[PDB]
Amino acid sequence: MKELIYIEEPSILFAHGQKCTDPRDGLALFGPLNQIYGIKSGVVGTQKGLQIFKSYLDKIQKPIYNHNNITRPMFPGFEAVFGCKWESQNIVFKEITDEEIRRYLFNASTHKRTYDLVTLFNDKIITANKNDEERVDVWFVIVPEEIYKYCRPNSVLYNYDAQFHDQLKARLLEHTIPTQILRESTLAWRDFKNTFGAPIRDFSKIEGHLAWTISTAAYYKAGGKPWKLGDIRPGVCYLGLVYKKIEKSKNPQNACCAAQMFLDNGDGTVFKGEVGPWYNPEKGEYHLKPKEAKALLTQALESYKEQNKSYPKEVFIHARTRFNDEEWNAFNEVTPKNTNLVGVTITKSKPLKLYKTEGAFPIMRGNAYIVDEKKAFLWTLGFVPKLQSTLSMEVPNPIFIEINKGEAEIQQVLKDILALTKLNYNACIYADGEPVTLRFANKIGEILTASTEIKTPPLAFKYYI
Amino acid sequence: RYLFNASTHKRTYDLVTLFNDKIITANKNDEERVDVWFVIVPEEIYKYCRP
Amino acid sequence: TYDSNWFPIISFPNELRFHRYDWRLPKQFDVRTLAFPAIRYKEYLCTFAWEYDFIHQLPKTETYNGQESIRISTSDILSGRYDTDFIRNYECQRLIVQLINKAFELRMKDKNVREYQMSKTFAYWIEKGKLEKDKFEKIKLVGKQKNKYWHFGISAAGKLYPSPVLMVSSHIIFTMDGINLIKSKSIQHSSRRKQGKNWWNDKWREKLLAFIRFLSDDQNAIYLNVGSEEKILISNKPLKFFGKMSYVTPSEVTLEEESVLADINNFEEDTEDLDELEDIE
RNA sequence: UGAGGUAGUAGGUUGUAUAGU
DNA sequence: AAACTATACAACCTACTACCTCAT
Numbered sequence A: 001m002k003e004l005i006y007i008e009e010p011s012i013l014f015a016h017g018q019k020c021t022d023p024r025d026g027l028a029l030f031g032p033l034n035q036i037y038g039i040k041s042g043v044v045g046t047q048k049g050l051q052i053f054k055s056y057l058d059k060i061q062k063p064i065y066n067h068n069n070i071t072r073p074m075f076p077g078f079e080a081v082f083g084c085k086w087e088s089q090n091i092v093f094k095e096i097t098d099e100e101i102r103r104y105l106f107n108a109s110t111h112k113r114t115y116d117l118v119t120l121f122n123d124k125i126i127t128a129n130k131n132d133e134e135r136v137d138v139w140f141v142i143v144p145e146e147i148y149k150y151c152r153p154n155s156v157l158y159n160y161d162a163q164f165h166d167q168l169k170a171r172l173l174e175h176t177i178p179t180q181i182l183r184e185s186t187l188a189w190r191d192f193k194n195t196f197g198a199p200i201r202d203f204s205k206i207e208g209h210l211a212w213t214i215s216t217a218a219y220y221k222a223g224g225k226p227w228k229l230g231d232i233r234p235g236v237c238y239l240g241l242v243y244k245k246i247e248k249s250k251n252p253q254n255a256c257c258a259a260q261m262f263l264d265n266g267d268g269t270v271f272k273g274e275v276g277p278w279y280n281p282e283k284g285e286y287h288l289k290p291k292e293a294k295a296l297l298t299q300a301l302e303s304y305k306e307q308n309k310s311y312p313k314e315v316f317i318h319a320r321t322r323f324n325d326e327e328w329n330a331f332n333e334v335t336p337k338n339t340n341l342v343g344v345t346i347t348k349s350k351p352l353k354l355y356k357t358e359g360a361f362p363i364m365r366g367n368a369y370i371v372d373e374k375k376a377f378l379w380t381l382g383f384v385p386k387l388q389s390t391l392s393m394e395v396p397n398p399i400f401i402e403i404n405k406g407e408a409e410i411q412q413v414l415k416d417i418l419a420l421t422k423l424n425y426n427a428c429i430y431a432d433g434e435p436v437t438l439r440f441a442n443k444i445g446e447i448l449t450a451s452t453e454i455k456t457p458p459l460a461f462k463y464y465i
Numbered sequence B: 001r002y003l004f005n006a007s008t009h010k011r012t013y014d015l016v017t018l019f020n021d022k023i024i025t026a027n028k029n030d031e032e033r034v035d036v037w038f039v040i041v042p043e044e045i046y047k048y049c050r051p
Numbered sequence C: 001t002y003d004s005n006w007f008p009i010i011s012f013p014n015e016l017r018f019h020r021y022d023w024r025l026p027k028q029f030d031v032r033t034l035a036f037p038a039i040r041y042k043e044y045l046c047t048f049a050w051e052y053d054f055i056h057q058l059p060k061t062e063t064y065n066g067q068e069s070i071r072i073s074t075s076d077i078l079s080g081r082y083d084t085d086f087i088r089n090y091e092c093q094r095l096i097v098q099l100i101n102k103a104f105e106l107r108m109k110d111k112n113v114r115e116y117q118m119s120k121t122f123a124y125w126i127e128k129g130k131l132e133k134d135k136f137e138k139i140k141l142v143g144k145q146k147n148k149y150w151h152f153g154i155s156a157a158g159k160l161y162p163s164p165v166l167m168v169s170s171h172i173i174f175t176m177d178g179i180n181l182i183k184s185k186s187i188q189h190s191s192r193r194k195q196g197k198n199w200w201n202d203k204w205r206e207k208l209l210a211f212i213r214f215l216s217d218d219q220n221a222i223y224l225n226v227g228s229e230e231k232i233l234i235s236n237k238p239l240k241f242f243g244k245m246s247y248v249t250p251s252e253v254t255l256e257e258e259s260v261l262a263d264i265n266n267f268e269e270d271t272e273d274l275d276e277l278e279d280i281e
Numbered sequence D: 001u002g003a004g005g006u007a008g009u010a011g012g013u014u015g016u017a018u019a020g021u
Numbered sequence E: 001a002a003a004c005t006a007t008a009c010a011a012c013c014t015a016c017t018a019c020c021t022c023a024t
Helices: A023-029 A047-061 A078-082 A098-105 A110-129 A145-150 A164-171 A207-222 A290-308 A326-332 A410-420 A436-448 B008-029 B043-048 C074-079 C089-109 C185-196 C201-215 C253-268 C274-278
Strands: A041-045 A092-095 A138-143 A179-183 A236-242 A258-262 A314-319 A341-347 A375-378 A399-403 C009-011 C015-019 C044-047 C070-073 C114-117 C122-125 C142-145 C148-159 C165-175 C222-224 C232-234
Touching: A023 A207, A041 A047, A041 A110, A047 A078, A047 A138, A047 A207, A078 A207, A092 A110, A098 A110, A098 A145, A110 A145, A110 A164, A138 A207, A164 A179, A164 A436, A179 A207, A236 A290, A236 A410, A236 A436, A258 A290, A258 A436, A290 A326, A326 A341, A341 A410, A375 A410, A399 A410, C015 C074, C070 C074, C074 C089, C089 C148, C089 C222, C089 C232, C122 C165, C148 C185, C148 C201, C165 C185, C165 C201
Parallel strands: A041 A092, A041 A138, A138 A179, A236 A314, A314 A341
Antiparallel strands: A236 A258, A341 A399, A375 A399, C009 C232, C015 C044, C015 C070, C114 C122, C122 C148, C142 C148, C148 C165, C222 C232
16 A cells, blocks of 8 residues: 655766676776775784685685676686785785694683783784884784684683674774784685584685675775765765673773764774763663763764865764754754754664565565655665575565654655665675664774773774774 | 964974874875875975974 | 565554552552453553453452543544543553553463463464364465474564554474473574575465464454453454565576575674584584 | 574652651 | 651663574
């Protein structure tokens, strides 16, 4: 009885000023907008890690294909898709001895085991970056199977997180060093054998997709922008607010809100929030004290001024929970009178499974549902005709947007969200369920709330994923 | 604005700190890696702000 | 054409009856024990039926009189017109959805079907032997895979602010013999993830429709005995919509590619999966 | 990457140990 | 200096927000 209005797929800008829907296929067609001249890879690990990383990179030099590449497109080779060169030569390596590994591993406490391993890795990165006459732009540490399976918190035979890469990145924030974490099981599925025999990380049919993801992550961390967005109106900032909960022992952790800002470029000019003991989790509705609200808004405004040399005529605010009215009263007292405030709440737990009456494929991605002029249902999950398969399993679930306060066209915020949800960098996929500013929200909150020693972190995005 | 200060030492301090935190801001937000930063100081700054 | 998982209200009952028993309600009495849904709103008992049907267990109700039992029109409740300092509109809607949740739970518990415990809700299933020939509307509902017996399930929780509808969340329950449930919840989750690749969305819709038709009693509704005289009718027909544009249907090979993509999600992430596989034998 | 599983709070119910006039 | 019957937070009765798990 009621229609499902569809929103067209926004095309991402590519090389030579052209646009295509799929990032993989079009990136194989055109390439990156601004080519880099190449980067040096610093692998930190063992000799086995050395040989397996060199073998994997030599494997991804030559073109490799997936099982069917309508869904997971081809990988023509790193030089054949990015332009910048990558070879096994001129690769810097740092020795990780078993003696330190064994001396650390023989301790029973797993948390201090994580502590000493991250301390060793950070110290070796520091002594590789502070005295070596050579230059490394990207680091690729390798964790073997035994370290990953023995550092689990609940494996049975306080100021830091139990997991590795979160606090590695958190302690590596201050020195402005980009790096990537690679599991041994990820790139060595050939010899990674379980009890049965099959690879646990069975990347055999999608080694092209694995090469796609790794190469895109490396080119992102290199410094060259892989892609940008197609259509952006002048004077809009997508401020996706984070409210990742922090559990630093028994001190008042409360709220540690953060944000990612999209003004005119794909990268998120992320500014750290406060440690922030206010708003006792009895009132754990994750609102904002006015002074931090104007602090964050002024931070975004001066970021827009320093990166665009003008004033933003419109503000987008994204979150998961609802918004109050006093925080917006504090917001509007500092905004210019020509601005516009929009607060959109994104939820997933709402149960709504539009089953298909007849056919062989479910509801596609992009078919939105309008309830009111302020709230709507958007399907960023499911079938897409370009990839010719769904991105979900069983039946996908949509996202429910809701403009809390502020007047706006629901179609405008729908198109803005659909344009935002196609910039996943660490994973090379056509689209995801949640938007990118919310997909990266958990990562940025985890990184910025893992080490309290960080005060003013680097506001470029390359040091996080 | 910085020229008409009385003692050149505080002018040197504020200009040096301005260049420093400009460089820090530039390399802490820009995604494009910069291997070498080229500080093009003006000649009259090197001349009129001598110790 | 697409059909959703919503089930709207066919005809909302007219009277919302509040029973101000005040001192006639025992303090230690458990409100959940009543055969009809109710709440202790202030000194009132917000019910849906008459006052004199609780005499089987409450030997003080017979002294209560009719005219102190106020009634509220639900048209103004659903339209938001209801404006009284006793109850405002939104918490009235909240108590309404609470009442219909309890009423559905008790009605469907009265039909003698089994129950499994979830975290913040409950999911339900038909035990073996109750359904003859293991078929309903030419749709399989409860079957056997490997050695574990799988039972399809639903979970219902209402919400009315766009329209008086009721959602249903599809679940699947597992057991080893068709008698007693699995002791560990993680084994149930593992079997759910194992059986996820076995079928797909069309079978999900078929099982959901079969469950909805099985829990119904009449043809185009279900019979919720909310009161001794007043019942609630749920549109067992799911709410259906359509899109102006859609795709072209491919062959069955891309369903295998979707199962392949499930295996890609198997390959891309893994988190302490080794203990539950190695130490299970 | 989406569906199940545990701790417990959005916002109004009624039990503890005082104090307003 | 002390009569009636309320307060002062404040624990707790059904359901709504986030972190960690298991597995394709």
